[PDB]
Point group: C2
Chain length 97, copies 2
């Protein structure tokens, strides 16, 4: 939920984005991935690069979490017709254009 106390509004989930006057609730990893892509508008990001930035340069995770979470992120954006902004550059990686 959302809390309003001393004139301060704070959400239990910090990892929200606003769109069309509505709210998308994300996880930390989804939020950081969206930011990373958006921060790099029009520049394609190689999967390993996304891994370094979102999961850590020394992460033991399998590189395909990026794929898994790109799908998670798209699914969160589908209800608001924003999913097609995350584009697969097949063979190299992902871009927000």
């Amino acid at each position: 939920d959302i809390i309003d106390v001393n004139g301060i509004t704070i959400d239990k989930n910090a990892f929200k984005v606003t769109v069309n006057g509505a709210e998308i609730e994300l996880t930390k990893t989804e939020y950081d991935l969206l930011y990373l892509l958006a921060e790099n508008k029009n520049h394609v990001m190689q999967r390993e690069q996304i891994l370094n930035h979102v999961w850590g340069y020394n992460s033991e995770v399998e590189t395909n979490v990026v794929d898994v979470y790109i799908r998670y992120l798209r699914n969160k954006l589908k209800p608001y017709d924003r999913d097609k902004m995350i584009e697969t550059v097949r063979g190299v990686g992902y871009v927000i254009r």
Copy 2:
């Protein structure tokens, strides 16, 4: 900073609260502490209880981080004249009233 892409607005720092049309930038731990207190409006929270909720039930941290971060939180609220909402109940703990 803040980013606006496909009609979506996302901040690099998720741990923001709004007040008087302005923005307070917090850390994760400060944000969770503010939420915990605000979620428990008018109920005093014992230090150990805050420790369990914000730092974990099995945390090895010294119990006085709560004090340290209450001060951090107050200092973040002082510029907007909201610091006095976090009250010391001396000897037991903290409350938002």
